[PDB]
Design an enzyme around this catalytic site. Structure first.
Site, short mmCIF file in Angstrom:
data_model
loop_
_atom_site.label_atom_id
_atom_site.label_comp_id
_atom_site.label_asym_id
_atom_site.label_seq_id
_atom_site.Cartn_x
_atom_site.Cartn_y
_atom_site.Cartn_z
N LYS A 77 1.58 -7.28 10.25
CA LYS A 77 -0.04 -7.66 10.10
C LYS A 77 -0.47 -7.09 8.70
O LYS A 77 -1.66 -6.90 8.66
CB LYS A 77 -0.71 -6.97 11.31
CG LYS A 77 -0.65 -7.87 12.74
CD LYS A 77 -1.17 -7.01 13.72
CE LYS A 77 -1.69 -8.01 14.85
NZ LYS A 77 -0.76 -8.35 15.70
N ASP B 261 0.81 -1.29 0.05
CA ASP B 261 0.02 0.12 0.01
C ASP B 261 1.01 1.26 0.04
O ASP B 261 1.72 1.41 0.99
CB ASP B 261 -0.98 0.02 1.24
CG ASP B 261 -1.72 1.11 1.61
OD1 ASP B 261 -1.48 2.21 1.06
OD2 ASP B 261 -2.42 1.07 2.57
N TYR C 94 4.24 -2.63 14.27
CA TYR C 94 4.93 -2.24 13.04
C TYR C 94 4.85 -3.21 11.85
O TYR C 94 3.56 -2.95 11.16
CB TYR C 94 6.35 -1.98 13.20
CG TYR C 94 6.92 -0.25 13.55
CD1 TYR C 94 6.19 0.51 14.18
CD2 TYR C 94 8.23 0.06 13.16
CE1 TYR C 94 6.74 1.80 14.62
CE2 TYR C 94 8.73 1.31 13.57
CZ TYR C 94 7.89 2.22 14.16
OH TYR C 94 8.40 3.34 14.58
MG LIG Z 1 -3.82 2.24 3.46
MG LIG Z 2 -4.81 -1.96 2.91
#
Ligand SMILES: [Mg+2]
Ligand SMILES: [Mg+2]
Ligand SMILES: O=C(CO)[C@@H](O)[C@H](O)[C@H](O)COP(=O)(O)O
Ligand SMILES: O=C(CO)[C@@H](O)[C@H](O)[C@H](O)COP(=O)(O)O
Ligand SMILES: O=C(CO)[C@@H](O)[C@H](O)[C@H](O)COP(=O)(O)O
Ligand SMILES: O=C(CO)[C@@H](O)[C@H](O)[C@H](O)COP(=O)(O)O
Ligand SMILES: O=C(CO)[C@@H](O)[C@H](O)[C@H](O)COP(=O)(O)O
Ligand SMILES: [Mg+2]
Ligand SMILES: [Mg+2]
Ligand SMILES: [Mg+2]
Ligand SMILES: [Mg+2]
Ligand SMILES: [Mg+2]
Ligand SMILES: [Mg+2]
Ligand SMILES: [Mg+2]
Ligand SMILES: [Mg+2]
Lengths: 385, 385, 385, 385, 385
Positions: D228, D11, D225
């Site tokens: 996950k 991401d 951190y």
């Molecule tokens: Mg995000």
């Molecule tokens: Mg995501």
């Protein structure tokens, strides 16, 4: 006059398994409390089960934490155990009687206690709740809603008498510390704690205006074993305390609670009817636990006190509006059971009553992840061969 | 002490049709077993029906396959047949009494038997099931789930005492061969067999840790006629055997079973409540079969044993959570009935109890497909003309 | 032995309105038939209502169309009317008693009769149905399905004994003509007639193999008034006749029938439970009619005959599977009621029991459509001015 | 030929918030991989998002844990971050790029990797999954079901080629230990571990018969951190590995997973369709996250490989049968959200990504529970005053 | 003019697995038939898939069982296989091409054929159906309903032109015998056969009045392998043949059919929309198979013929009324999948395409049931030890 209302609850044997109680246990207990009332130990009483838990509700004027009232409950549970549970070899016979000797206070010995002492009001409506297959923290969400959520309790907004809010006594059952939090201003800190329902449990609630006791939930510090035992809860209603209907609206969403099978799962708290309520005999027979030893259920009996006498009980989940809530609970119980042994249907590993993790870790070979990474090919060929 | 628990079940007449039994049949049977208990033939008993099947549940210390206990059941069914069923001309009067003379063992003579002998545990919870309008293989799915599916029985994962699994005794009722399969390791072979529910039927289950008997299902080799008869099932629960709730969760999906109308259809197994349960009179009246002679239903009665006495029964499908499961069954029964006479709602042709296929093949002219292909035009014009 | 089974039914007063009957009416009728049985006029009886209609079910050996049995029913209804209905000023008191004098046959005088005489079989299961707020044609769809639809009655396909089909006696109640049609071959002609449920009504069904009577529906030619009266139906079951469950499956879709409020609407036929059934007292109390004087409901009581004695009745719509069918009916009744006064919820104008059309056409000015077309502008300005 | 299939996911910025990605990010990434393919770094690729996570799926022949393939993904994410995310100030711009310098392996630097190398089969069907708003353990239940639950994967029972089962490589992400467990025999120990989905995660699965790689899930040890992060999963299908439909059936119950808002809640995993799939442009645009930043969703794209080229992707949740599963997920998301901040909807306190518990415990006065008990009256009066 | 309409269908490769086809396969096939039409081999065509099955619908004037039309289809499937399926290594590439050499008739070589020749009517509406993941007997229920059930096809009752009924040509695919049965009179014998959907399959239907061909279903005798292949069906509609809507009403109950995963399960036949229909390009892309490789689905394309040209296709399941039927199918697919590997969700053992029963019976020790009975104790102790 000042009156104490005490619920003392134990599971001393199920019928069969942990599904229900044998009706002679309730009969025995009610006759024993009738004898105590004739001797003036207590004023009045009512005996009922939800699941395999028997609640003795007693009114008296001996105050909180009284050794004669706690002893009366201990002796009643011991006599049910010896005369009825052991005779019929009921399952978990004497389960909650965790010492041989009554010390003076039943708290911490396995049975659960919720009690409040107060000046009896000009009308004194109270509700007694009992839940099976869950923990005292199951009542954290309902107690928060009825005393602090304006979407549950309209009085907080429209009742100038309730506008000042409530004081929550929260017990950390792990480190044995008590927090006092006041709503509305402390709502977010309170929730930061009592959202962790297995650690921070609402034990009492008082009215902010005057300090009046408003609710008492059965919870004790955790011991090794003791403290996740199925709870009981007393709530006073009306006249600056939430209306009977505001208290009941706090149970109208059948939220997920911890307990259910083996004390190791999450399922919906169904607000259930009693099978029968006999105000003359002073006995009510609550619901059974069936699929997967539940789902967890709560019963609600309303009373009006007069000079400490208990007129009631009235089953307060007995309304077609609550059949929608039971149907919701029955559908959510079927959905979540399809998850089988996985979190979050199974509880976090610190929170489960049953585990076989020691046995597993003794039998399954671990590999340091760094070492394993070089030799994965070799380890897989070993298993294949 | 060692105790034997035996269920012996027969249909000796329905009221009306195959929908239910006449209550005097249960009254007669309970009085007859009360006489046997007074004479010391048995310790205790309970008499109940589901549909048109009457189960005699007896406890005693004569062991499995005992001629006096089997004879006691035979004589009780014969006296119900002569005194009650034939008097009222009930439908299928004496249906399951398939010889004139008791040989010594009732098995194979039409009535169904499920029995287990064991040392009575410090608490001994058991559940007795009875299903109408289906076959013994109807219990293959529930028995597999409660002893081997970790999505049903959480103890298999989290109960170090159940981790070792179970031994299934599977009867091939066609070739009369027995297979012993151990879970977890044999789960896929076991399912390869017991998925064919009309041929490979779980007859007994034992605990792997110690060999303790855990369940017994009524099934007999097929005869010409005998063997698809509506089953009964005994299961011991708790303490290293599945909890009462794990046993019941195995019935919480109302799966399709073979039977229903004319023994020739598939429909959902509805877990039904009893109409009434009278622990004093030792009688429970189970549910009726209505649309399409069903749908098939199973009842569950829980007991706790003590010195062989039966305290119970408790109806263990009596919970709003199981009303969701009954509603599911009622909706699936309506969906599948719109299929009328077609497989898979109608059973495979080897598996149906009724057929008119001989009469049809005697009246409908076949054409060899090769010959027919040349003369199709001619054959169609013949029919049209 | 040959036995006649006769149901004779009337509405002699409702409580309140047309919603139900007064229980003393059933008590009175049962005591009167008990007197007749003591005098040997009849063998046995059972008295019940559905809605505001009381059915007297009698067994006897006097044959069909017997003046003493018809007179016995007439006198019972007259005495209920004078002693009970008129005393309490019940609504429609004596409604169906349409002459002052019993002529010898009750048929055509308003009460409804369904009767069959036959040799009593080795087991003789029968079902008695009663429907309120509808017409005899309400049973055309169920009777067609149970005797001729292979999606209802599996025996037609898989029971070589039923393969030959059935003979339907259909009454045109308008022109007073009878048609005899045989299924399977005549199914499409039969349906062409009995789809018009207010004109062509199945009155009797016989087995094709041997001519055995299989069902009798109460229907009479129409008179001026008489003939749309709420029906009763007798069906013999099993052994080459549809199974009890095949008969009941024919009611498992709650189809739209004509009747309901004011005999002038279409609504779903709900298969309803009886409120109580007392086989000792020989009385069952059927369901009430509530919203919009319904919806229309049918009750089903099963019996087994022996030497003409009636063991029963058993309520055969009492199963959670039929609660799905009741819920369907309750939802369709709410949907179709939103149509208010429009066809097809309101019946066709020839078919409605109530109309105000004469009063309307006397008050509303018609315009010949040709003339109106030239002067529309003028006629509208007239109304506007 | 041997081929490696690698999914590397990050991401690097949401649009808006964490709800979705900006389409130019996918366009940029696909053009960058097209350049790499033209230079022969990779064979083929496909770029897609679910939520705010972009997956780069690449095929190549450089093997697992390759620095040029990991570097290619790092550089692509860095260039998207600098050219697109930072330019449009997207939310969490560069979120997962957790160092300034590529070390040689992307694993542990925030992006997620699932890769497998194998000899390409005569037909080589694979499915690539991506889930947003959850953790790698979200796939523990589906991976267990498709490789070990005979109620999901019929091949385990009826496919002699799959009868031998599978080997699961489970990573304890807390203590950095690997367990190898073989089904069927180890199923209960395996579940004892992987039911704790935040600690023991299935990382790879191999076929027992031959050791063939069958699945790879993105998971790394936990760091402060990292770990996950929303997962991606590669599964090979058919021919002794579960059929495409068996893989997909493992997602047909939308089970509760950890993640959703603030990485701190449990909600149902909805199997969602892609908004668009463009096999020519090599881009698919997956679903948005909306209420409460979810619910969590998984997308499934199927491909067939040939000489490492990817023909696909095909959206494999695009079927009205899965709309039932989406509707179930949407209803469960609404039910569980009514629980607000309470376990088990909120995660256990060790497992939540966000907490304010330090700030709370710094501001709320604790009382030792022993001391508090004596002075409760005084402390309450203090608050009231 | 006389025209032949032929559907010839094969699965020559799926994308991925058996879930769908690659769109270039449809493009290739349509271009190949466009070439055949330009050369005058056929008049017109339409190419479409449902699932992984491609149907070539062709009109021409060469009659039934024509070697040039069968060869044209064989060559088209072979060229798709070599140019497209093998190039992309699609799953089951060339699956249905079961010899190396075209003999002259494609029937029995794996592909499915349904064809009819007739004089083209003044209006000639036809519907082409294709079902994936099931057997030719899946159409037995719809074909029975549309030609013989008066609850489906109102014309049988109210259309004097259809009153005479239909002639069904039923193939026993086991013993290779053909039965000709005429409705209404033969309905019960017909159903006695075609209820066994894996053995007696409707292959053709003709109108009784004149012998006109009305439908043709693809079915061939069983071979070893060949004959359970996913079917295709042609139906002519209107003007004394069922209306388009009567044909479609026969699919409005999504009945259980045999097939689904591994050709070894029962699930509901969902009437599905096409993803796209392009009448200019002569291509329609049908639905995917997803959970558990289904559920089984049928597509329906309507055409009007003129001089053999095909105007169409029109997707005839594209109506919100059929979304209710799809939702029913999606809910029944989820219910029945919870049965896992048990009959009747798994097929009878003679009827399943996959079995591991040989491997099982080779590894699991049988005990003669008589011998086992004496030594049960010993055998259990052996397993326990
Ligand atoms: Mg995000
Ligand atoms: Mg995501
Ligand atoms: O009578 C009604 C409404 O008409 C109740 O809803 C009360 O208003 C409520 O129970 C609060 O009553 P107090 O506690 O304020 O007396
Ligand atoms: O009491 C509970 C839960 O609080 C039951 O769910 C038991 O844990 C379960 O019935 C297994 O009991 P055992 O068989 O292990 O004794
Ligand atoms: O017992 C069953 C099924 O096991 C019933 O469904 C009967 O088969 C049916 O009622 C027809 O019975 P007959 O009328 O043929 O005797
Ligand atoms: O136009 C309508 C209704 O208004 C259609 O429902 C036709 O009546 C039906 O399709 C039969 O048409 P024929 O085959 O009899 O021409
Ligand atoms: O074609 C069908 C059913 O007709 C599929 O359900 C396959 O049987 C399944 O996908 C397993 O295929 P294999 O992996 O065994 O080739
Ligand atoms: Mg207990
Ligand atoms: Mg309890
Ligand atoms: Mg019977
Ligand atoms: Mg029976
Ligand atoms: Mg009336
Ligand atoms: Mg009436
Ligand atoms: Mg295929
Ligand atoms: Mg196919």
């Amino acid at each position: 006059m000042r009156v104490t209302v005490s619920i003392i609850k134990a599971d001393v044997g199920g019928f069969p398994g942990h599904a229900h109680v044998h009706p002679k246990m309730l009969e025995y207990a009610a006759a024993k409390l009738k004898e105590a009332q004739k001797r003036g130990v207590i004023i009045d009483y009512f005996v009922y089960n939800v699941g395999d838990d028997i609640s003795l509700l007693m009114t008296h004027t001996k105050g909180e934490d009284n050794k004669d009232i706690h002893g009366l409950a201990w002796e009643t549970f011991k006599e049910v155990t010896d005369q009825i549970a052991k005779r019929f070899k009921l399952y978990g016979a004497g389960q909650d009687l965790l010492k041989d000797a009554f010390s003076g206070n039943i708290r911490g010995m396995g049975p659960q206690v919720a009690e409040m002492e107060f000046e009896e009001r000009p009308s004194e409506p109270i509700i007694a709740f009992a839940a099976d297959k869950t923990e005292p923290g199951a009542f954290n969400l309902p107690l928060y809603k009825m005393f602090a959520d304006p979407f549950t309790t309209a009085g907080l907004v429209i009742d100038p008498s309730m506008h000042e809010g409530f004081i929550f006594e929260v017990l950390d059952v792990v480190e044995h510390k008590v927090y006092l939090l006041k709503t509305p201003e402390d709502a977010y800190s309170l929730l930061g704690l009592i959202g962790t329902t297995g650690r921070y449990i609402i034990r009492k609630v008082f009215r902010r205006a005057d300090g009046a006791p408003a609710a008492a939930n059965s919870v004790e510090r955790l011991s090794l074993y003791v403290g996740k035992d199925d709870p009981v809860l007393l709530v006073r209603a009306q006249s600056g305390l939430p209306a009977v209907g505001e208290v009941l609206e706090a149970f109208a969403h059948p939220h997920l609670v911890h307990g259910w099978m083996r004390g190791s799962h999450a399922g919906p708290l169904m607000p259930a009817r009693f099978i029968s309520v006999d105000p003359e005999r002073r006995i009510a027979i609550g619901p059974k636990m069936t699929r997967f030893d539940g789902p967890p259920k709560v019963g609600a009996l309303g009373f009006q006190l007069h000079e400490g006498y208990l007129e009631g009980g009235v089953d307060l989940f007995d309304d077609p509006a609550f059949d929608y809530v039971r149907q919701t609970a029955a559908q959510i119980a079927d959905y979540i059971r399809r998850m089988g042994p996985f979190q979050p249907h199974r509880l976090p590993p610190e929170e489960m009553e049953y585990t076989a993790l020691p046995k597993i870790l003794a039998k399954v070979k671990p590999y340091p992840a760094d070492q394993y990474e070089k030799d994965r090919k070799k380890y897989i060929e070993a298993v294949v061969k």
